[PDB]
Amino acid sequence: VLKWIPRNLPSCLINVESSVTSVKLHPNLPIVFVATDHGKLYAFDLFNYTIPLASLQSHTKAITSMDVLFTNYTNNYLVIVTASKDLQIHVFKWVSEECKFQQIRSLLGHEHIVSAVKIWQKNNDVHIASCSRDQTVKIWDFHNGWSLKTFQPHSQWVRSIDVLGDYIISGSHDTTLRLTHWPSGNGLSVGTGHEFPIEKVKFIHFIEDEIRFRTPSTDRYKNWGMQYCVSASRDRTIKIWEIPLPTLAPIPNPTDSNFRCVLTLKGHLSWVRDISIRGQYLFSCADDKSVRCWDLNTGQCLHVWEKLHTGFVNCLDLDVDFDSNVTPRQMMVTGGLDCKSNVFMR
Amino acid sequence: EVMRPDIVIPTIDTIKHEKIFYDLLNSKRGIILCGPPGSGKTMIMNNALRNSSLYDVVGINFSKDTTTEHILSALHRHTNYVTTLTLLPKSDIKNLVLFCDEINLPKLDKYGSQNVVLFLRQLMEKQGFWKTPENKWVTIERIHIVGACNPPTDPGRIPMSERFTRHAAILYLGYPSGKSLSQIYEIYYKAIFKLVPEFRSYTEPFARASVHLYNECKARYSTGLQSHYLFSPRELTRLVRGVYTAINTGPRQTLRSLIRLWAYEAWRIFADRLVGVKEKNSFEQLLYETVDKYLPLGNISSTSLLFSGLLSLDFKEVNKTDLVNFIEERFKTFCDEELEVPMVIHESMVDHILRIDRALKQVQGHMMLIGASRTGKTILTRFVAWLNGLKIVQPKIHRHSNLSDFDMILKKAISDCSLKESRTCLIIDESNILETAFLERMNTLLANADIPDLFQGEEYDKLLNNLRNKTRSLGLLLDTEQELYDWFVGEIAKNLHVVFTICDPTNNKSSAMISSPALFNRCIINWMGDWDTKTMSQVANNMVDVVPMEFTDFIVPEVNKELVFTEPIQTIRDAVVNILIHFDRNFYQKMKVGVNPRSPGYFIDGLRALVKLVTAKYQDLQENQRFVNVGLEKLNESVLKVNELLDRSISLVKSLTFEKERWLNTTKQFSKTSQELIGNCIISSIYETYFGHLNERERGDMLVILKRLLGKFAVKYDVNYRFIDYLVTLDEKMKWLECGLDKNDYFLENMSIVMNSQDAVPFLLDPSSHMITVISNYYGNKTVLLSFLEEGFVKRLENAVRFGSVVIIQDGEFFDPIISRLISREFNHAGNRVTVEIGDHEVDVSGDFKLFIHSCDPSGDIPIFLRSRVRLVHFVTNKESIETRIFDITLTEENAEMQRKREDLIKLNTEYRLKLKNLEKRLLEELNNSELMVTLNNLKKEAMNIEKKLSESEEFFPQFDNLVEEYSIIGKHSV
Ligand SMILES: Nc1ncnc2c1ncn2[C@@H]1O[C@H](COP(=O)(O)OP(=O)(O)O)[C@@H](O)[C@H]1O
Numbered sequence A: 001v002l003k004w005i006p007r008n009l010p011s012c013l014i015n016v017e018s019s020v021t022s023v024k025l026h027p028n029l030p031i032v033f034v035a036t037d038h039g040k041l042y043a044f045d046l047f048n049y050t051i052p053l054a055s056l057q058s059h060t061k062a063i064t065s066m067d068v069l070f071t072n073y074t075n076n077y078l079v080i081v082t083a084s085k086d087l088q089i090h091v092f093k094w095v096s097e098e099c100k101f102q103q104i105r106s107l108l109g110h111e112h113i114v115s116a117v118k119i120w121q122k123n124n125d126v127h128i129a130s131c132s133r134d135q136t137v138k139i140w141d142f143h144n145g146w147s148l149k150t151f152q153p154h155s156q157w158v159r160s161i162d163v164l165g166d167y168i169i170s171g172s173h174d175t176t177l178r179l180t181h182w183p184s185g186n187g188l189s190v191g192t193g194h195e196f197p198i199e200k201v202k203f204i205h206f207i208e209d210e211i212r213f214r215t216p217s218t219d220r221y222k223n224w225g226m227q228y229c230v231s232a233s234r235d236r237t238i239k240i241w242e243i244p245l246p247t248l249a250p251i252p253n254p255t256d257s258n259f260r261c262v263l264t265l266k267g268h269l270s271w272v273r274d275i276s277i278r279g280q281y282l283f284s285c286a287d288d289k290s291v292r293c294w295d296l297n298t299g300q301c302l303h304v305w306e307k308l309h310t311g312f313v314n315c316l317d318l319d320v321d322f323d324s325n326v327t328p329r330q331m332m333v334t335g336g337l338d339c340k341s342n343v344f345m346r
Numbered sequence B: 001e002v003m004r005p006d007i008v009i010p011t012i013d014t015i016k017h018e019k020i021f022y023d024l025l026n027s028k029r030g031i032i033l034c035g036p037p038g039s040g041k042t043m044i045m046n047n048a049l050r051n052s053s054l055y056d057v058v059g060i061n062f063s064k065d066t067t068t069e070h071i072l073s074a075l076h077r078h079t080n081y082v083t084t085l086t087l088l089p090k091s092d093i094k095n096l097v098l099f100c101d102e103i104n105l106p107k108l109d110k111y112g113s114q115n116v117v118l119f120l121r122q123l124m125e126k127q128g129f130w131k132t133p134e135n136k137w138v139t140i141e142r143i144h145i146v147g148a149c150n151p152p153t154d155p156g157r158i159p160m161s162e163r164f165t166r167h168a169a170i171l172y173l174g175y176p177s178g179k180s181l182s183q184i185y186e187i188y189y190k191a192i193f194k195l196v197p198e199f200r201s202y203t204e205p206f207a208r209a210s211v212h213l214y215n216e217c218k219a220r221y222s223t224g225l226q227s228h229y230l231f232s233p234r235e236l237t238r239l240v241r242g243v244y245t246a247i248n249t250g251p252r253q254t255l256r257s258l259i260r261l262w263a264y265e266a267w268r269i270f271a272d273r274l275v276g277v278k279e280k281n282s283f284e285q286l287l288y289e290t291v292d293k294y295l296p297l298g299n300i301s302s303t304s305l306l307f308s309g310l311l312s313l314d315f316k317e318v319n320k321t322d323l324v325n326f327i328e329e330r331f332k333t334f335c336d337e338e339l340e341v342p343m344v345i346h347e348s349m350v351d352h353i354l355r356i357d358r359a360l361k362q363v364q365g366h367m368m369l370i371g372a373s374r375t376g377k378t379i380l381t382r383f384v385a386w387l388n389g390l391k392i393v394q395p396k397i398h399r400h401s402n403l404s405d406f407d408m409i410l411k412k413a414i415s416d417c418s419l420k421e422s423r424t425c426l427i428i429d430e431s432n433i434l435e436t437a438f439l440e441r442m443n444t445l446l447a448n449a450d451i452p453d454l455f456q457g458e459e460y461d462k463l464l465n466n467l468r469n470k471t472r473s474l475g476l477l478l479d480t481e482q483e484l485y486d487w488f489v490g491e492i493a494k495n496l497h498v499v500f501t502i503c504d505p506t507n508n509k510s511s512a513m514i515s516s517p518a519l520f521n522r523c524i525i526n527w528m529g530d531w532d533t534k535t536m537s538q539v540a541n542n543m544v545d546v547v548p549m550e551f552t553d554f555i556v557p558e559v560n561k562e563l564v565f566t567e568p569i570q571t572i573r574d575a576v577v578n579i580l581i582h583f584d585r586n587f588y589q590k591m592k593v594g595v596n597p598r599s600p601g602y603f604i605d606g607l608r609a610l611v612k613l614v615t616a617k618y619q620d621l622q623e624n625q626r627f628v629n630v631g632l633e634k635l636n637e638s639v640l641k642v643n644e645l646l647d648r649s650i651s652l653v654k655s656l657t658f659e660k661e662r663w664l665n666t667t668k669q670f671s672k673t674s675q676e677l678i679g680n681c682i683i684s685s686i687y688e689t690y691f692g693h694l695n696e697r698e699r700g701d702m703l704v705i706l707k708r709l710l711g712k713f714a715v716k717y718d719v720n721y722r723f724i725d726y727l728v729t730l731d732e733k734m735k736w737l738e739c740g741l742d743k744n745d746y747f748l749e750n751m752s753i754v755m756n757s758q759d760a761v762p763f764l765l766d767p768s769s770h771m772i773t774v775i776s777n778y779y780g781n782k783t784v785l786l787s788f789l790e791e792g793f794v795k796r797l798e799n800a801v802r803f804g805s806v807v808i809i810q811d812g813e814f815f816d817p818i819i820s821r822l823i824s825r826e827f828n829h830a831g832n833r834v835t836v837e838i839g840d841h842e843v844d845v846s847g848d849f850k851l852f853i854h855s856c857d858p859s860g861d862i863p864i865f866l867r868s869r870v871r872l873v874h875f876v877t878n879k880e881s882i883e884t885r886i887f888d889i890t891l892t893e894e895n896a897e898m899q900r901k902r903e904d905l906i907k908l909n910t911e912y913r914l915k916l917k918n919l920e921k922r923l924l925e926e927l928n929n930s931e932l933m934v935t936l937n938n939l940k941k942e943a944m945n946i947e948k949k950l951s952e953s954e955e956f957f958p959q960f961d962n963l964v965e966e967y968s969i970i971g972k973h974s975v
């Protein structure tokens, strides 16, 4: 149920007026979300692609990334947050009765182009993460409407981030990664080994089901929360990084302030644009009009999906399996610069 | 082992020369080696000196300006001053050998002596020298001297005194024979082809083919054609190294792939520097003959060989279309990330990107981009460096600078390359070399892997401290000074690639750059030259295919095939492209440019101006026709309703008969003006962008040329064309006249060019210094007057661009290179904000910021970098201006009342005509937005009153005509 591999040909083709920059899968109902270089935010279902569910132009420029989440409360809706090149972040409300888009509010404050967005829920509290060319990651509060933390984890500008509880890792333009503890806002470790700027970085979430890189090593490091982080850059490589253990407000160890080359992998002909984790397999694409599936165990490209897009292919993602509230269904969507998108079913 | 420069193949001649060179060293006798470039003097002495543990090599390269202090600076890091004075080497066992390359290069003074030659003969004959700062005699004890030189018959080589060569044994080395070259390079090709055992039997034909190609290139391309057509075995070693690199970083090869790869390497080694297309075709036929006679495969032209490692993990030939699309997407990303430029990519650009990338991948890989200005030298260098991840360092050399700023910039660049291991591309323009000491620094940096002059003394000590700290950071075990400095120079050689940009190779400074011995034998000369007409066709089609083009009838003319360089004519787009290319060729031919490279900046500027002007004019014409059509339809509907079915409506209908007639006439002439819209748009664009630096006579001549060439390609234009009537609006005309323009149409035309240049900053060449006052009246108190010759000008300009005030910079012939990023309009858009880099710190652009450059010196000195980007406009007085000014002066000093009445009447008449034109505009707007009848009647009555006033005012013109006829003799004698 977790070893699903996509076929060699998509069953549906999505036509978009402009290039697709980001996609996201609805964890509950079969609806995929489509970007637009013109700045539109589409809504497409997996059975009738001939007509959009909704469409609007709220951004004067193209968008960079999208993310969704269905919140839970022990005391219930899907929230859409989108960042664009118009110096603003727009948070949208997705209704299910009439299946339209509703605008909640717009976030301002970033000095230049915002690029990545992360959303998480913990202790019945939700926040929105954000990084831009202002070389500062800014995490804001959805309910309060004000920022909660702002710090500089890199000399140059940060392109991609991810959040796992109280830790956040940043991917910048200067070929180095920085792990920072969010409530304290201090750097912990640095990672060298890259020669080209990072495109997207995310954690290797712990799963329980025998994957080498998705299991803890020792009891204390199991209690740390996470072991590995996966990062893709423009040197056509995706690198797996071993996080050193800090002094545990964590304190950086002077003798353990450097990362380690757990596993580096090659095989892409151009800049690896995105990464995703599903079971023992890692999915990725690049500018070489190809989609891959790299096994975490042997570190070898199992399947090559060649020439799915005439131009560049930008975005792909899977369903989250580490979260109990989200069922990891066997849906895959890929979006490309050729103004077309491919969705894989079964 | 091909990449290692210390490898030799022992032949008879090599071992003979090496043994006698070693014997002459061991005799404590001076040695001077004479031979043509590439003979192998450096090779034999390096070979003879690695096989000895008793001698050490110090490498000095002499240029046109080398002094004694350079020879001293190259040795103080190698030698210790001891008082036993005595200048001993730092080592106690090994001796020292002073390789002085190109001894003939240092020049004579005005009294026929060379300083360094006399210093060397003092070093050998007298065994020492007098230390200048404290006047003491230091005795050289264990330093030998080795000279390498070329025969004096070569150009740039000057005779050497016999008092020097008395003490120096002389050996002559000629070029190796063809058989020896074939043997040596079949050994090289066997070493290369060890990687491919399937084709190990083709080594000898490949080597003989390479040697034959070398001999035919050396015979055909001699110095008599071009000053840099110097070929040597070093070219063939570079060919071999490129072949090895492309084999090593490539896939499994076939025999056809080997032929194509070797041919591409030969193209990039031999035919990079070829200027004329005839020599390129000669090299193509020579390659065909060499392949046919030696290695018995498709077309082997330069553009048909596109080898690249961008599209895969290995170096291999790629298709054209996928490479073009990949480069277009990468360049869009580059414009999004580093700097935004409106550049479209063509095939020769793709080839230039490939060869620049090929050179930049190499260790110790430099460039000399020779070609016209605005060709794409530095922008493609930056793009290739961004693809490779290199760091761009453009030196901040400006006016009021000296060697100290260049030394600090190069020191910081070397420190970043070595200590910080930051891979760096260093781009040197021809305008960044102010003095010949700049060339000395560049030559020392390229010949060796350092500059010993900068880092000497306490600078040497802090270098040692920094390098020990960095090496201890990297965990490398080394203690000696020699190993540490070898690591230093290895890091410098590995992580630094100097790229040279030359715009005018005929200039003396650029000739010194090209003819420099270390800038020639180490760099990779890349003579791109002026754009060929195929490139112009590609860029022109690619930049006019995005506009609404086909909206009128077109008949393809029957023209000669030879004059058409584009695809066969099928619509007006190819006709427009051919017209623009042909006019560029004719303009550059008539200006007597000679063999000088021709800048395509005029062509690109005219293309962009045509695009924007035809867009604006078509929008305006479509809007005007829509308004006229809906007004006529509304009038017809109202007339039909009145006929089918009260006094005010009837009066309005009857009074608007003239407007209906005018609307019908404009509707009838819409077809005529749509026929001629493309033609006069082309004429206006070219007339704005090409004729800015021209006088009236040649402007009229080239306008006749443009009209004839436009009628040749069946593109219609306006027979009664006039640029003032087509661009200069009446509101702008009155604003300019009240701002202080002359009544001459030449000056209004020039200012119309000045204001209608929103992309390029205008150059105001006004000797009378009147345009400064005019523009100061134009922008009111917002304007500011700066100067290149004043102090604190940088801060004034920065404050002016923060506030957004309009800037006029005086003294344009003293151009300051710090504003070069403002000149090329390199703007970084910070979201809604625009920022630019001036000097050393970035500054914001407000949006209402305008830049003007003024110069009152005719026949001044405008650099080609400044010349190629600015809309240079001459303001030179002529016939009509003299006549008008003399007439005005004599009227003012004879009868001022009549002159005042005449000028007031002219101003009132033109104001009344403007009010009339705005009034018909108001009637058209009111009828388009359909109380109203009473307002229309009032406006019609106002029009009638103003027309009657003008008719009454037009009764004094014959008196002015009589005054003109009376004072025309005074005017013509004045002129
Ligand atoms: N065994 C050999 N015999 C003769 N020439 C050789 C041999 N091996 C290499 N060469 C050639 O000699 C050249 C060395 O020339 P070089 O000494 O750099 O010229 P210069 O004398 O102007 O410094 C190399 O490019 C190489 O091709």
Ligand SMILES: Nc1ncnc2c1ncn2[C@@H]1O[C@H](COP(=O)(O)OP(=O)(O)O)[C@@H](O)[C@H]1O
Residues within 6 Å of the ligand: B341, B342, B343, B344, B345, B346, B349, B372, B373, B374, B375, B376, B377, B378, B379, B380, B501, B503, B539, B604, B824, B865
């Ligand atoms: N193929 C092209 N299409 C459009 N513009 C071009 C092209 N090639 C060059 N340019 C123009 O040339 C400018 C950059 O030229 P640059 O490399 O700075 O010339 P140089 O090296 O002589 O200073 C750009 O502003 C661009 O407008």
